[PDB]
Amino acid sequence: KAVVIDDPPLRQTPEPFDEQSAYNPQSPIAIDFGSSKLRAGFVNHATPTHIFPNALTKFRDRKLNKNFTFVGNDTLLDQAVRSQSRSPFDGPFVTNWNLTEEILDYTFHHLGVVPDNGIPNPILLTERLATVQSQRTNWYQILFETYNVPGVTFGIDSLFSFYNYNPSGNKTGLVISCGHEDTNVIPVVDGAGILTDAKRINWGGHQAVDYLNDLMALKYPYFPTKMSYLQYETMYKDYCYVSRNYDEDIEKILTLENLDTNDVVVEAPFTYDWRNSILHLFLRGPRPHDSENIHEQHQMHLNVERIRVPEVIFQPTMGGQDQAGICELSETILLKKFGSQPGKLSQTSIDMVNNVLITGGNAKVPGLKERIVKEFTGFLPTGTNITVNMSSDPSLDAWKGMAALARNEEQYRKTVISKKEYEEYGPEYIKEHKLGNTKYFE
Amino acid sequence: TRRHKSARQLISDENKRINALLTKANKLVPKATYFSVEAPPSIRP
Amino acid sequence: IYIEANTGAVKRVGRSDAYATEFDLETEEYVPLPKGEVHKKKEIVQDVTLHDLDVANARPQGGQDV
């Protein structure tokens, strides 16, 4: 078998800008303020019009007033402008406000919306679960006394995806979302998320790429070239899958017959027997090491532990967080809450088992659904029908969620927080609608 | 001219707000905050 | 564990590997979870003789069950 090489750089988009001047002054605007991808579009369209990496930069250019290529896909023309392109999103919260104003101004330019006072359209926001009150007050500020939006409402994007795949609005289910920086498990009864019993794991997919960076740097402390973080996402989203059973795989993952098909070798760009030695199998794979070759110094020999990176959402103790995995959280939800005991299931628990949805940008790792359904049938009673639902692309289905909430008129008008209600009630106010957040107390 | 607030102290001054509210109320079980949403540690080894 | 429904015999196979890391070293024998179903039923035939039933209930010192 001839050993192949894998160059990881990602290409540059040559056409960044596309917008239309014709627009509807009464149709609302649906935007998903994702940690990884900004999504933008109208209401009448089924698919989101604009997909962006939610990042912006401040390019300093001499003799042209030092302010160019600010927001969006314009950073994707050159690697130099994409290098310092600062996504303002921290772990839980975005950080800078003028940056987010520039994101909103750029995307409002990209629907061709003309001024009419501030903005003549209602907005459709996505809000993270258990949001800090200061964030929601400053969100109220940056809509109302910044853009003059008449209609604001926001909710959990996983609940939006559940409403998208269950448009009836009164179904019972369990949604397991894995976002860029956060994963959570939320039970929905009668269309209403019982956030009181929802749980959260602080891993997401950003910490998975950070874990791969830390692993592959600790494996090779003397690597010649600096491995870029974008290339870490690139070779994470390509060679990482979830095993069916993690316990019996790691005792097989470094055998000689398994290394022929499991191991893929990546190549970084530039310009005493080894068979009995399992350190040679771990470091240099099923091929003998040529220490004089300039390729083998740059050979980024991954895939020996490609199972370890996506498994950590089931065992968060390998990631450093002392939290029970989504398997244990689903077990506690389906076997200890809503009147259900270990041994007999309530009807709500059976309906929740019969409708399980997984979504998010980190859900497109292969082997997730089979592992989820095998682990679910591990602890559930025999004969209980388990249905796990998946999307073709589970990252942008939340946008279809607020689109489906926008098509429904009477379900739109329950959740609308207006300017007048904000003015009489102050910025400390939460509409306890079912498709979103709730009060901190009773 | 709001300051460049980081993601660290926002959790702790929410926590300060929650203790201020519960000490001014008890002299009130929370429903869904950023801390009650947190997953408990696992019970199996 | 192992339970026979008709006889009533209980046999402890041993601790599962889900609890194999409670301690680094212990006298427990860690056996895997059964891959099949919990409940398994089948038909068998018992071929005995009359002498077997004769010596089954003619013991000067009993205790063949234990």
From Swiss-Prot, chain A:
The keyword rRNA processing does not apply. It comes from the Eukaryota. GO terms for molecular function: enzyme regulator activity. Keywords: Isopeptide bond, Nucleus, Phosphoprotein, Transcription, Transcription regulation, Ubl conjugation. GO terms for cellular component: cytoplasm; Ino80 complex; nucleus. InterPro entries: Actin, ATPase_NBD. GO terms for biological process: chromatin remodeling; DNA repair; regulation of DNA-templated transcription. Pfam families: Actin. There is a cross-link at K1 (Glycyl lysine isopeptide (Lys-Gly) (interchain with G-Cter in ubiquitin)). The modification Phosphothreonine is found at T13. Present with 2170 molecules/cell in log phase SD medium. Probably involved in transcription regulation via its interaction with the INO80 complex, a chromatin remodeling complex. PANTHER family: ACTIN. Component of the chromatin-remodeling INO80 complex, at least composed of ARP4, ARP5, ARP8, RVB1, RVB2, TAF14, NHP10, IES1, IES3, IES4, IES6, ACT1, IES2, IES5 and INO80. This is Actin-related protein 5. It comes from Saccharomyces cerevisiae (strain ATCC 204508 / S288c) (Baker's yeast). The lineage of its organism: Eukaryota, Fungi, Dikarya, Ascomycota, Saccharomycotina.
From Swiss-Prot, chain B:
Signal peptide: none annotated. The keyword Transcription regulation applies. It comes from the Eukaryota. Keywords: Nucleus, Transcription, Transcription regulation. One of its GO terms (cellular component) is Ino80 complex. The keyword Transcription applies. It is found in: Nucleus. Probably involved in transcription regulation via its interaction with the INO80 complex, a chromatin remodeling complex. Also involved in the regulation of telomere length. Belongs to the IES6 family. This is Chromatin-remodeling complex subunit IES6. It comes from Saccharomyces cerevisiae (strain ATCC 204508 / S288c). The chain holds residues 57 to 111 of 166 of the full protein.
Curated annotation (Swiss-Prot), chain C:
Transmembrane segments: none annotated. Coiled coil: none annotated. It is found in: Nucleus. Belongs to the RuvB family. Present with 11600 molecules/cell in log phase SD medium. Probably forms a homohexamer. Interacts with RVB2 and may form heterododecamers with RVB2. Component of the SWR1 chromatin remodeling complex composed of at least ACT1, ARP4, RVB1, RVB2, ARP6, YAF9, VPS71, VPS72, SWC3, SWC4, SWC5, SWC7 and SWR1, and perhaps BDF1. Component of the chromatin-remodeling INO80 complex, at least composed of ARP4, ARP5, ARP8, RVB1, RVB2, TAF14, NHP10, IES1, IES3, IES4, IES6, ACT1, IES2, IES5 and INO80. Component of the R2TP complex composed of at least RVB1, RVB2, TAH1 and PIH1. Interacts with SPT15/TBP and HSP90. This is RuvB-like protein 1. It comes from Saccharomyces cerevisiae (strain ATCC 204508 / S288c) (Baker's yeast).
